[PDB]
Amino acid sequence: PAWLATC
Amino acid sequence: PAWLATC
Amino acid sequence: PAWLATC
Amino acid sequence: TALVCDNGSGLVKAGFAGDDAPRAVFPSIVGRPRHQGVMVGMGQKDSYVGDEAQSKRGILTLKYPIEHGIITNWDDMEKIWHHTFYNELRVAPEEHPTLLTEAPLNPKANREKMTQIMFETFNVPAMYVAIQAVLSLYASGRTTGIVLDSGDGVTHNVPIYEGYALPHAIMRLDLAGRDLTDYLMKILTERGYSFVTTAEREIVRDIKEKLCYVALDFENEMATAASSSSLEKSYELPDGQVITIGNERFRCPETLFQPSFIGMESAGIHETTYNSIMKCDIDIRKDLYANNVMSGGTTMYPGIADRMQKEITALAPSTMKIKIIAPPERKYSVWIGGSILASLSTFQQMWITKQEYDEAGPSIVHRKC
Amino acid sequence: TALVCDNGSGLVKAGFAGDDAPRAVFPSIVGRPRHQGVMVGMGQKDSYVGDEAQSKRGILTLKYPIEHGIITNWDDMEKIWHHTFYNELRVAPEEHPTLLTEAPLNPKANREKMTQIMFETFNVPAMYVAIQAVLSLYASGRTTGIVLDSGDGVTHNVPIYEGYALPHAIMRLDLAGRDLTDYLMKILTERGYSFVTTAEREIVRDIKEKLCYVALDFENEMATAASLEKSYELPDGQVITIGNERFRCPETLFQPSFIGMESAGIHETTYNSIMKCDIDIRKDLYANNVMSGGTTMYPGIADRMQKEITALAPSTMKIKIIAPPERKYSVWIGGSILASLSTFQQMWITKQEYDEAGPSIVHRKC
Amino acid sequence: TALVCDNGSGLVKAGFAGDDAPRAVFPSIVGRPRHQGVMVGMGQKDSYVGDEAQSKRGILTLKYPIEHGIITNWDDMEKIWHHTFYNELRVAPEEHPTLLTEAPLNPKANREKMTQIMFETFNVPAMYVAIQAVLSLYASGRTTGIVLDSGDGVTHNVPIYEGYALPHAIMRLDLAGRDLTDYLMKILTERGYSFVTTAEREIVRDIKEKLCYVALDFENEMATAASSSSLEKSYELPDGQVITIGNERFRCPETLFQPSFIGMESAGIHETTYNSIMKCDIDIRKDLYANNVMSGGTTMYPGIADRMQKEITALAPSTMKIKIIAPPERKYSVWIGGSILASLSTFQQMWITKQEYDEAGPSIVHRKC
Amino acid sequence: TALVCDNGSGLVKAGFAGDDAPRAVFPSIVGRPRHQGVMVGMGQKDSYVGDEAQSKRGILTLKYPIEHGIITNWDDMEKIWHHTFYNELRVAPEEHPTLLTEAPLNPKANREKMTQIMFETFNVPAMYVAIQAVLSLYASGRTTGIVLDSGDGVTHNVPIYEGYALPHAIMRLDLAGRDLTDYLMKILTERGYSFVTTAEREIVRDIKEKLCYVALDFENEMATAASSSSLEKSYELPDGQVITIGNERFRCPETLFQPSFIGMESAGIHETTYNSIMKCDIDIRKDLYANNVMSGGTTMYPGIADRMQKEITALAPSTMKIKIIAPPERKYSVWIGGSILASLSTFQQMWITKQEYDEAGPSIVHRKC
Amino acid sequence: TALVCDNGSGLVKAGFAGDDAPRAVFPSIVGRPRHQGVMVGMGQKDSYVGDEAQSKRGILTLKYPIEHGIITNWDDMEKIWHHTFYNELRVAPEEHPTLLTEAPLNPKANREKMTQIMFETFNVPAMYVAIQAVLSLYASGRTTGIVLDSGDGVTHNVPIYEGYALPHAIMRLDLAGRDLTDYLMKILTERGYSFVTTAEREIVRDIKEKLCYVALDFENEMATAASLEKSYELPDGQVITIGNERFRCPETLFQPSFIGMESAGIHETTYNSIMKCDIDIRKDLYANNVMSGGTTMYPGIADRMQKEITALAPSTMKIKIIAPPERKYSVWIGGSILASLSTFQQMWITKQEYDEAGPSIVHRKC
Ligand SMILES: Nc1ncnc2c1ncn2[C@@H]1O[C@H](COP(=O)(O)OP(=O)(O)O)[C@@H](O)[C@H]1O
Ligand SMILES: Nc1ncnc2c1ncn2[C@@H]1O[C@H](COP(=O)(O)OP(=O)(O)O)[C@@H](O)[C@H]1O
Ligand SMILES: Nc1ncnc2c1ncn2[C@@H]1O[C@H](COP(=O)(O)OP(=O)(O)O)[C@@H](O)[C@H]1O
Ligand SMILES: Nc1ncnc2c1ncn2[C@@H]1O[C@H](COP(=O)(O)OP(=O)(O)O)[C@@H](O)[C@H]1O
Ligand SMILES: Nc1ncnc2c1ncn2[C@@H]1O[C@H](COP(=O)(O)OP(=O)(O)O)[C@@H](O)[C@H]1O
Ligand SMILES: [Mg+2]
Ligand SMILES: [Mg+2]
Ligand SMILES: [Mg+2]
Ligand SMILES: [Mg+2]
Ligand SMILES: [Mg+2]
């Protein structure tokens, strides 16, 4: 979620 | 009573 | 409401 | 032959395993009389239950035993199961397995007490309690999709990829078709119509499920209907009066996509599906975006099935197509899935038996199902 | 065998249970002599109760013991009950259960004193007191409808849906036949005839009972009447002619403002009685309007009430004014029904309960 | 200088913004003479309004324009506003603002037509319609509390935590002193006294206002009064006859805590305050339990605050303290709060001016109030 | 005098260098009001930030600007930095140098935008951003150990032999106390207690902080609690209710040692520490096994400090000595190490000054740290 | 007809001898389901091997059975061999002779257990385990060269003059594409992309295969990039942009200090393996530099070696880096060449030889 790509 | 419909 | 605790 | 009961919080849908339509459809209410009965030799027994307690609506106190999926009053839910097995189906439950149902993320006392009542007060030979949103995939036949169930108390997404469900990504929202009725009966007041009691909740629900539709652009529709346009709908009350609800016809199910109307902090059903997809893995997401299965009675509006496809595409990636599967016999889909699942030769070893029950107690549904 | 005594306020309609017409029908007046007798070797006892007072009417003063449903004089209501038991039905009441009656929304001293008299004076084994409109719905066989009772003191609506009465919506109005008799003998004075005393009231009542009729369109009849006359023969060879005052006398039922009553007519204490019921109940309470009592026997009302409730009820709802032709004794027919059911034998007020709790058990039961 | 007219449904309490007590306290009744006057001098008039209709009570037909908070008759409510502005306050409304009032959950036609009459007939410079249970909190000076208001019609319940009112938990009931008078004059007939007319409602109301009291334990008081005790109170009529009601003085206000006497399906005013608290958040409940403001006329019974505390302590958790506040000047509390709220320098930008009304008509009140 | 702040995703710990305890401990939440405020004449600012937003949390919509160590929103993070400098510390930032922190393996945009906001908005003379796991070794005083820092979003394993970090052997895991609070409020629903909103997430965190312990033998504890035993613990909600949780006391911090409960594929903290040790050299391992430092808030359970020593000795060589260095003041250990490192004469030339910043822009943070 | 399989640490390449390209390649992956299967029709097979495990990445926990050439888990390797025979070629192993392979300087337990499994489970009539780097020279046709094999686990140089492989001048370096992918998914963390799981390592490998290229002048490229940007689309619809981190990933092959290795690059271990030979051999070993494997398929790997070995070579020496375009399956091509020889026909290991002295016959016959 918080990143950019994954999670 | 005295509403527009019910009561 | 209708649970056990909250709601 | 097995029995497929679907205990909803507002509609009991029962029948036999192997059919294609539920044989017993009647609401889940138990009516108590609240008035002085002065006759004699009269058939006013004690308490009416089901569709019998909708004819004598003006005298009765209509109580729903199930609320938000969980069961609150266990004495009259026993009455509803007794009425369903005898007066509406006419079958002895000592000769039939029974396939029950439950919303996910429920309290664990419901499974145990439902098993204890079905095994000790009804003496079924076998029983099994499933999860609602799994069965809507059995009904569609596919085994890949994210099932959006709704209808009278519970609204929950369960993603399933290839027969493997992801329980770390299931969501559950308590915003289904009871809060829409209680919001419609409160937004009706500002026009002039004051429906208050439990007998008038049925009239508000009968308004809701045949006039209310879901808008596409809510801010465009609230400016269109603000002009004197062709949106009003006269509805004939059971005493004779007509009521013209023009503007509060799409404001009732726009609560489903903006839950701040009742003061809930949550996001709408278009965003507990996107988050429930984004909690799944990257290989799973591509053909979870393309299989959105709707279910339940609340998803039977003239709108939503092409409004979810507009709201999810606003926050999905651009090169990922969406297909909201609306199989328009979807109101009984959680029963069609139970009729399919109970009629399989692969399934018959999954039944909780009586000999398992007397050696494990009602704590065996936590390790089964 | 039980006793069904519809102890009304204009006449006493008593009889035996299980039948379909009362044995005793006679007015409830206790006439007393007012002049001085001179013939020594005669009768002339002390007082004449019933139709004997109508026979010796000119020498008498006729007192009504019941006024607007409540019993005002207990010393001769005991006389009327004694007369109806012995001299008219000829039964010792120590071997018979009795079924009394009462208008709704009454003072609760009546329910106590009637029970106290029926147990401590006549020694009834077991009694019960009903309501005049539940029995009127028992008579028609239904269990669904709204009743409208009338006759010398009370006019009340008791709506029942399925045996479940709605006791927060029982309108009571005191505008029955005695207040029409007293308006007829007041509106006849403009023509010239002056009826004053109690015998003249008993003549004006007989004028009302056969020459008066309810109009349909009141202003149309008041315009037609200025162009319809009748002729009643007084009991000494004399004729009067009432032309206009035969629909103005029962028009007070639909317009109570003629005697200064603030309340609305009987077409608006039925609509307002339905409009306090619930929206499921109104759909058939519109379509089941039972009628009972004496003052609904005009050649009018049963077509005028439909005409003036159809202008108040919503236009998509049909209205059936159920007017049985044998409706004058409908409360008694319902009482003979209600005392002939095997479900009812555990509903009486036995002598043991009266010895245990006293006459305060009548509000507890019934 | 602004004007504060708490236009109630049973009493019109108007005055000047800045004081602490209303100048004009008089009921809202318009009397039409039902009799025939024969005196060729002056002798009579056409329609008396206010306390003239209570002075000439015998020959008149007393008619309340407002029923249950909603205005039903706009012709004589204009007469009552005209009477209050001229004959009782002696001002010109073209040089004064006006702070009106309204119960929560009303039809929008009240808010529209009240603005239209105040601007197009009396020609006020500015106006603003408040809501009653906010102004009781303004009068008490708090910002945290759940306000119970009553008096001749509506009985509503508005919870406010820090100024942020929670409008999804505002219960509204119609069980106030009008419906208590119509039950007292129906339970008096059991004793023998038959009060019928509209002039004789103003005597049963005067019986209620000084003999009726709220019990503590209702089933204990109904067993105490079964013996002849000190509950009897002799009240005399306008003519010299006396009546003695012993038992029916804690059964008229018992309809508040038990609405099943009048056939209402609702629960009592303690339960629609416990439910109004339980629809709030867990942080808010702790200091809404300890701040219970009572307002309105029908809360001036003797034992009402102790009965409310006893019947909320059985519903709240035992480790949470309750404090039913009740000032002695709670009858005019809405007017005191109106005089406070109109006398703020913060508020002078919150008026609906004439210039806003000229450009969008009487529809700015929904977006401005 | 220099400033040492510890920007975590949970609490913000700040103060002056040279001390031994932070002056300012308050959570990193910014709350927005979601209800309509009608108490005109009050103080109702549009954004509450800090422990005051935890005080008035029943109205607010609480939101953490940091998720999993990285900053999602810079608008209400500048609010928290402004509140920390001004309201809670009462110092202008134009005089003092600042010392921030960062989790390892974070994106470069965090360092760049943090430098840009600290220099071009608060105008500090000098700044420096360290790594959150070196400072625990600095506070412990050792130059040898493998630091396990874990609180609210991240979990590191940074080995340092003698002042030489091994960047090919650091392990980052996103499994700290935020996911434990979410799993606790998802597993409480099985018993009956249903916590949904952010205002109830803040209650479930307070349940977790004072009732959850880490088990030693998980199967034996799950077999013990299956019998009716003394593992139950009652907790009182802020409105008055009591909740009893018997089994989910160790099931909430068992996700740290079995991350397959929340659906994570990774290995537990006992195995990532072992893999971080085995990624080092053989001469380094002999005294990396002996010095196992812990830090952060999630290492403050009554369990883990003697379950880690069991689970690493289960898979270490038998002749190797393991000693988990768990000081009791380890919650503020990162700030203690920051206050030590900022009060050094050797560190005084390691600052990123204002002159060298604008000569190279905000990209100097990648080479100077 | 003989069988030639190339059990690499990456993808298993198998097929029939005497052919030119392998029959079917697929990755050496055995995945297990890690979620709860709630269905009854399907959700089966309990473990997926090879290509279906790469198809269902989301459910499965993929796990390679070979790490740096050695075989850690023997159970799933039996699954992979059984799949590669049966489901991929549909041949009984009892009929055909099988040609295996092995990286040099492996533990001898690999050869022993490989022989034991290939005889006592598949009943192969004749096996032979070869060495990977000689098969590249057999595919190239020469007998002169130094083979820079580089697959997924291992990377090793074997110099061969004309036959007579020098076993003292052979290096081995564990720095291959798996260690490049584990560094790429750690260098992608700077831009903001976090790949954690095995199913995301299977995406980072796909990013490395088609966007990473070997730079020529590393400092000049690092100064230039501060437009080298490319865009890859993740399989859920999301795009990523990696400009700088596509020549830094294969730069670890020439600077092993990035991932913390003491060793030297492939341009330097090749030079040390050349200089460990005699003096006369270098004049042709410099001129013949064979490369193989999949990790030598970057855009510019051959040019970088040709540039950087000449920086540390004598100036009068010429270097030709033999980079065939079909070098990804060159070890299998050499196996298919070498298995179709009448000279090699006598070089097998029969079942009768294995029945004597157990599985240690490959320690003398290989
Ligand atoms: N045609 C309809 N249109 C919109 N809503 C409907 C319609 N029919 C039923 N509903 C709503 O769905 C609810 C019942 O549907 P259902 O999904 O079967 O509930 P449950 O799962 O509890 O059995 C009703 O309460 C009603 O609010
Ligand atoms: N055919 C009639 N037409 C008009 N009025 C009648 C008629 N018959 C009876 N009445 C009136 O009704 C009164 C008696 O009716 P009844 O219902 O028996 O009164 P109660 O029930 O109190 O005994 C009479 O006094 C008379 O005024
Ligand atoms: N001292 C009192 N005791 C009991 N009831 C009262 C008392 N005073 C007024 N009431 C009742 O309250 C009603 C008026 O109260 P009020 O609050 O002024 O109504 P509103 O809010 O509409 O103006 C009256 O009709 C009466 O029934
Ligand atoms: N007494 C406690 N026991 C266990 N966990 C705690 C305790 N106190 C706080 N925590 C957890 O640690 C987190 C905050 O601790 P902290 O190390 O300061 O995080 P950060 O470094 O990001 O600021 C909280 O979210 C909480 O889940
Ligand atoms: N076209 C390519 N470009 C760059 N690297 C590749 C390419 N193809 C494969 N690789 C890398 O080499 C490995 C597989 O190649 P291969 O030599 O066949 O392995 P093995 O020798 O174990 O069979 C993969 O892990 C991948 O990282
Ligand atoms: Mg359902
Ligand atoms: Mg009668
Ligand atoms: Mg008021
Ligand atoms: Mg920290
Ligand atoms: Mg290879």
Author numbering:
A (entry chain Y), B (entry chain X), C (entry chain Z): 1 to 7
D (entry chain C), F (entry chain D), G (entry chain B): 6 to 374
E (entry chain E): 6 to 232, 236 to 374
H (entry chain A): 6 to 231, 235 to 374
The authors write:
The cytoskeleton protein actin can flux between globular (G‐actin) and filamentous (F‐actin) form, and this polymerization cycle is coupled to various cellular functions. Here, we describe the electron cryomicroscopy structures of phalloidin, lifeAct, and utrophin bound to F‐actin, providing a comprehensive high‐resolution structural comparison of widely used actin markers and their influence towards F‐actin.
The available phalloidin structures are in complex with actomyosin or actin/filamin, where both myosin and filamin binding overlaps with the D‐loop (Iwamoto et al, 2018; Mentes et al, 2018). Therefore, we determined 3.8 and 3.6 Å structures of F‐actin–ADP (called apo, as this has only ADP bound) and phalloidin bound using cryoEM and helical reconstruction, respectively. John Wiley & Sons, LtdThe cyclic heptapeptide, phalloidin adopts a wedge like conformation, and the binding pocket is buried in between three actin monomers. This indicates that phalloidin mainly interacts with two actin monomers and stabilizes the filament interface. The binding pocket contains a mixture of hydrophobic and charged residues contributing to the phalloidin binding. Superimposition of residues within the vicinity of phalloidin also does not show any major side‐chain deviations between apo and phalloidin‐bound structures. In the ADP (apo) and ADP/phalloidin actin structures, the D‐loop region remains in the closed state (rmsd 1.1 Å). While in the ADP/jasplakinolide‐bound F‐actin structure, D‐loop adopts an open conformation (Merino et al, 2018), the rmsd of D‐loop between jasplakinolide versus phalloidin is 2.4 Å. Since, we have determined the undecorated F‐actin structure, we conclude that phalloidin binding does not induce any large conformational changes in actin and resembles the respective nucleotide state of F‐actin.
